[PDB]
Structure of venom basic protease inhibitors IX AND viiib:
Amino acid sequence: KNRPTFCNLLPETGRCNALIPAFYYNSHLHKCQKFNYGGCGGNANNFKTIDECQRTCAAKYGRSS
């Protein structure tokens, strides 16, 4: 019943940091935001780009063919 609001949740890199296309939605920004990740931690809020980040936290767009 209705999705969660993890988009507001605060993820964790895992005491690390490295250039990686990690992306998630920010309510204050009302859009997606890219964050840095390496491979130590990782919370629910964490995608690979604005695409998967827009269909999971934002609305749905035309993506099939």
User: Anything to note?
Assistant: The chain has one domain: 1-65. DSSP finds one helix and two strands in the chain. The longest strand covers residues 22-26. Helices lie at 50-56.
